[PDB]
Amino acid sequence: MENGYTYEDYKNTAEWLLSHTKHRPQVAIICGSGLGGLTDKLTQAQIFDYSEIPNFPRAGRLVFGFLNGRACVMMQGRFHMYEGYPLWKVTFPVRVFHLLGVDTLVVTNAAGGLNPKFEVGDIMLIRDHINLPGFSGQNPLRGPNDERFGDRFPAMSDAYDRTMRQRALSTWKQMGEQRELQEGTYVMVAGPSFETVAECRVLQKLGADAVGMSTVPEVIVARHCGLRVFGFSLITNKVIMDYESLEKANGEEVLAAGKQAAQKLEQFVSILMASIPL
Amino acid sequence: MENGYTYEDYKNTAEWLLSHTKHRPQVAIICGSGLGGLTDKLTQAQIFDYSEIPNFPRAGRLVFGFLNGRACVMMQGRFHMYEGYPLWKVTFPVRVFHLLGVDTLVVTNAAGGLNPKFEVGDIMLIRDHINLPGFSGQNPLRGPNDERFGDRFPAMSDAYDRTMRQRALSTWKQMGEQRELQEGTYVMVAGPSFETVAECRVLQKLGADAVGMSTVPEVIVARHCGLRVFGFSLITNKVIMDYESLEKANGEEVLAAGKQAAQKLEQFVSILMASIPL
Amino acid sequence: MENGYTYEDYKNTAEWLLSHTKHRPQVAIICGSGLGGLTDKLTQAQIFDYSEIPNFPRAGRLVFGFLNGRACVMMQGRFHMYEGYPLWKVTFPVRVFHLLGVDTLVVTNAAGGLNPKFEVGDIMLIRDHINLPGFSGQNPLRGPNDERFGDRFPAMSDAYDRTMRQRALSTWKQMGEQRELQEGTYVMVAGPSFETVAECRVLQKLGADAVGMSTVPEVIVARHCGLRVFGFSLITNKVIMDYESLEKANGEEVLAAGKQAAQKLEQFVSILMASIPL
Numbered sequence: 142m143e144n145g146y147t148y149e150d151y152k153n154t155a156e157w158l159l160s161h162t163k164h165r166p167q168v169a170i171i172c173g174s175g176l177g178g179l180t181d182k183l184t185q186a187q188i189f190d191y192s193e194i195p196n197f198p199r200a201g202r203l204v205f206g207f208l209n210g211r212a213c214v215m216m217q218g219r220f221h222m223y224e225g226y227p228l229w230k231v232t233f234p235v236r237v238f239h240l241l242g243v244d245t246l247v248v249t250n251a252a253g254g255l256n257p258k259f260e261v262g263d264i265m266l267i268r269d270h271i272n273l274p275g276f277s278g279q280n281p282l283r284g285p286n287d288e289r290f291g292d293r294f295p296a297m298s299d300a301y302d303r304t305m306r307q308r309a310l311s312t313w314k315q316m317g318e319q320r321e322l323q324e325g326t327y328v329m330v331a332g333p334s335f336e337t338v339a340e341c342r343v344l345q346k347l348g349a350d351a352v353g354m355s356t357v358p359e360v361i362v363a364r365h366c367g368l369r370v371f372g373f374s375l376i377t378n379k380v381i382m383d384y385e386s387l388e389k390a391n392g393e394e395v396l397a398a399g400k401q402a403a404q405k406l407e408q409f410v411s412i413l414m415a416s417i418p419l
Numbered sequence: 420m421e422n423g424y425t426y427e428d429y430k431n432t433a434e435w436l437l438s439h440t441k442h443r444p445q446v447a448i449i450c451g452s453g454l455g456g457l458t459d460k461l462t463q464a465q466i467f468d469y470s471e472i473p474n475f476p477r478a479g480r481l482v483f484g485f486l487n488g489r490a491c492v493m494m495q496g497r498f499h500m501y502e503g504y505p506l507w508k509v510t511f512p513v514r515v516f517h518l519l520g521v522d523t524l525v526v527t528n529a530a531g532g533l534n535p536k537f538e539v540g541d542i543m544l545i546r547d548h549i550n551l552p553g554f555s556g557q558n559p560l561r562g563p564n565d566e567r568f569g570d571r572f573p574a575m576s577d578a579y580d581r582t583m584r585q586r587a588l589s590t591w592k593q594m595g596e597q598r599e600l601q602e603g604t605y606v607m608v609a610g611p612s613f614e615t616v617a618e619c620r621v622l623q624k625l626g627a628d629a630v631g632m633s634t635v636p637e638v639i640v641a642r643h644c645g646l647r648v649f650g651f652s653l654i655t656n657k658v659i660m661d662y663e664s665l666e667k668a669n670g671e672e673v674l675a676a677g678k679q680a681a682q683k684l685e686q687f688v689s690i691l692m693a694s695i696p697l
Numbered sequence: 698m699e700n701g702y703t704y705e706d707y708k709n710t711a712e713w714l715l716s717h718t719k720h721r722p723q724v725a726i727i728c729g730s731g732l733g734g735l736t737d738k739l740t741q742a743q744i745f746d747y748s749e750i751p752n753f754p755r756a757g758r759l760v761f762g763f764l765n766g767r768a769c770v771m772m773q774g775r776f777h778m779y780e781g782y783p784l785w786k787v788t789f790p791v792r793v794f795h796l797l798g799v800d801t802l803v804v805t806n807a808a809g810g811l812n813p814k815f816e817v818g819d820i821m822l823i824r825d826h827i828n829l830p831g832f833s834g835q836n837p838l839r840g841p842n843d844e845r846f847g848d849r850f851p852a853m854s855d856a857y858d859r860t861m862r863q864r865a866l867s868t869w870k871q872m873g874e875q876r877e878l879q880e881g882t883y884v885m886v887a888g889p890s891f892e893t894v895a896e897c898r899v900l901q902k903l904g905a906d907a908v909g910m911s912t913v914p915e916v917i918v919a920r921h922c923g924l925r926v927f928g929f930s931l932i933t934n935k936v937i938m939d940y941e942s943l944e945k946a947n948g949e950e951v952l953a954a955g956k957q958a959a960q961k962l963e964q965f966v967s968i969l970m971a972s973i974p975l
């Protein structure tokens with residue numbers, strides 16, 4: 142295997158962007174889908190379709206602008222391993238962002254609650270991840286390493302910025318809420334099918350608190366090239382963890398688990414901006 | 420990655436079959452190898468070699484006929500990830516079956532007993548699975564989804580039909596047997612080499628009861644497109660679970676673990692037919 | 698998928714080698730990198746670069762010679778899944794070795810200690826492995842099997858020769874050392890990034906004692922074709938197993954964890970030679 146992109150392809154995507162928008166983003170935000178009407182909060186919103194973007198994998202848009210005093214770039218729609226993309230395509234935008242000048246990555250996603258304490262609607266702050274595809278070989282850094290981005294063997298034990306995590310628990314308290322900010326381990330599985338009961342039990346045993354099909358690869362790539370990362374999971378569903386229970390996970394409840402729980406998340410992210418140091 | 424087949428290739432395999440046999444199967448059966456002399460029980464047996472079959476991966480035969488009052492199609496020999504097939508080839512026949520008109524899938528396989536209660540010879544009824552290749556990306560649905568088959572994000576928490584499971588425990592009692600029908604979680608690993616002792620201990624800890632190298636992908640594809648699924652593992656070997664024990668798993672004992680334990684299985688499947696609703 | 702090499706490519710690499718060196722090796726040694734200045738201990742050292750070697754994947758050298766009374770072949774630098782090589786390239790030299798006449802494989806590697814009893818510097822003798830890439834499909838034997846090498850379904854429950862393990866604990870006692878020879882399960886993960894804390898906790902729970910990114914595939918291929926295998930991990934780092942700890946795994950401490958701990962290892966291997974039966 143080999144990454145299709147050369148250092149230069151990245152570099153030429155970045156330049157193209159640098160020249161087609163006067164915005165100079167500092168914070169990249171990678172939202173779910175449902176969990177990002179977050180586009181209206183921006184101001185001076187400039188949109189590019191992925192389709193116009195030299196090299197951009199493949200209705201997918203890059204929106205540049207200003208969230209609450211920070212210059213942002215928001216990916217609206219992301220790529221997934223389950224769509225068939227190799228990981229070096231899934232995480233191509235991350236490297237592009239670094240070269241645009243960005244120094245922080247915020248990632249959000251929807252995920253099934255594995256911890257029996259979580260409730261549909263909860264926001265879980267990501268403290269750590271379990272990269273199960275990565276154990277087998279599906280790590281987005283597989284291949285020759287390019288030292289212009291970062292090291293051969295980057296560390297992930299501190300992927301999720303301790304400072305931003307503290308500031309996120311501050312901010313949340315900064316509005317004394319009906320539920321608290323949750324915290325835990327996000328496990329990535331490839332999907333696109335949902336877990337069996339036995340699989341759920343496997344993931345609870347591994348120590349995971351939430352489960353989804355994304356995020357981890359962008360986080361690894363982000364950290365490889367020196368960005369500060371933090372993120373959240375909107376728990377959209379409690380994963381079925383025993384056999385009598387006749388109820389099921391669907392793409393419908395994940396999507397339709399926008400509502401006040403998703404608006405909550407938008408506003409939370411938008412306030413966070415103020416805790417990101419210039 | 421991308422599935423090599425288009426909706427049309429399936430469709431043209433099905434039509435070719437619809438026109439070359441007057442049989443109209445309702446139940447697809449996917450047997451092991453050793454565990455399916457089950458071909459003689461059929462009547463009005465019409466055979467096609469895979470080799471004559473427009474598109475069929477690659478001595479492999481589709482046998483059409485009548486098991487105990489049901490119109491069947493029996494795959495004789497299957498494909499495996501360990502032979503090098505991508506999963507979209509392994510599970511191609513499943514989609515073909517759906518379009519032939521089939522509404523039920525019975526899958527059987529040979530597997531090592533992980534549960535220390537099992538004994539060589541036991542039939543384990545499949546209650547659930549742990550799809551370890553699927554955690555990393557080897558899910559046969561990886562790629563663009565085709566809604567003519569089914570949803571983007573199908574559920575697997577109920578893959579193994581509760582009704583058929585109940586009817587299977589009925590039927591077994593319907594002949595008050597020397598051992599009981601076993602029940603549990605089948606875990607798929609890719610192979611083709613057998614597990615170490617430490618690996619066995621891993622799989623026991625995950626909650627698995629039996630282990631093999633097949634089945635799970637056909638089950639996921641079956642469920643993706645609305646079939647009713649049930650299956651069995653003939654436990655052909657107790658997997659070596661500690662270090663003094665000098666005895667070893669071989670392809671010889673799996674094969675030669677036909678005998679009265681495999682005939683038992685044939686007859687069991689053949690009676691089951693009567694519990695499959697028209 | 699398919700292995701790029703045919704039985705003949707192996708065969709022609711071997712012959713080329715058989716004819717370009719009068720050495721006839723019996724023991725293949727596959728060292729780390731840092732953990733093999735072991736080249737000077739050899740005598741009658743003949744070097745080939747990988748680059749001159751018909752078919753050899755891709756500064757990489759095969760060194761032929763004599764360790765302590767045994768005819769050796771030492772791979773200096775190896776291939777890794779994380780560099781992008783498929784496993785059938787990573788393990789190509791192993792098959793070549795078998796055809797050179799070799800009957801034993803010694804493998805060594807650097808690995809993070811998962812067992813809280815290990816200490817940086819410790820040598821762990823490999824008693825077993827957990828091949829996590831192999832669970833998902835990344836097994837170097839994936840594809841049609843070639844019976845000239847070995848069986849379709851080889852066993853790995855005895856991969857790590859019990860005799861050589863006993864002789865290794867003898868030999869170590871044969872110099873009554875400040876720490877003892879450690880022993881345990883090596884788990885392979887693909888890398889190239891290092892584990893999170895949560896991942897470490899996963900691997901401790903699976904029963905693993907050390908973790909690295911190599912070895913397992915060569916061992917599986919070695920055993921597939923009948924070689925005797927034994928190996929070691931030099932524990933170069935204690936893997937970070939809880940969150941307050943601010944210290945991190947780096948490629949620098951792994952490399953610079955040569956020193957007296959690596960010389961110890963060289964000398965240990967060099968004495969071992971005397972326990973390998975002719």
Ligand SMILES: O=c1[nH]cnc2c([C@@H]3N[C@H](CO)[C@@H](O)[C@H]3O)c[nH]c12
Nearest residue numbers: 251252253352353354355392395572
């Ligand atoms: O219970 C779950 N298991 C795995 N993934 C998801 C998700 C996320 N939502 C999407 C599927 O609805 C998918 O893109 C995935 O990342 C929500 N709930 C679950």
Ligand SMILES: O=c1[nH]cnc2c([C@@H]3N[C@H](CO)[C@@H](O)[C@H]3O)c[nH]c12
Nearest residue numbers: 529530531630631632633670673850
């Ligand atoms: O102990 C085992 N581990 C993994 N697979 C199998 C099998 C099944 N039998 C075949 C190998 O003998 C293979 O196709 C696999 O699906 C029997 N026993 C075991």
Ligand SMILES: O=c1[nH]cnc2c([C@@H]3N[C@H](CO)[C@@H](O)[C@H]3O)c[nH]c12
Nearest residue numbers: 294807808809908909910911948951
């Ligand atoms: O803590 C660890 N986790 C995973 N691999 C390694 C290694 C081994 N060392 C190399 C990276 O420094 C790499 O080739 C890997 O096989 C040392 N320590 C660790």
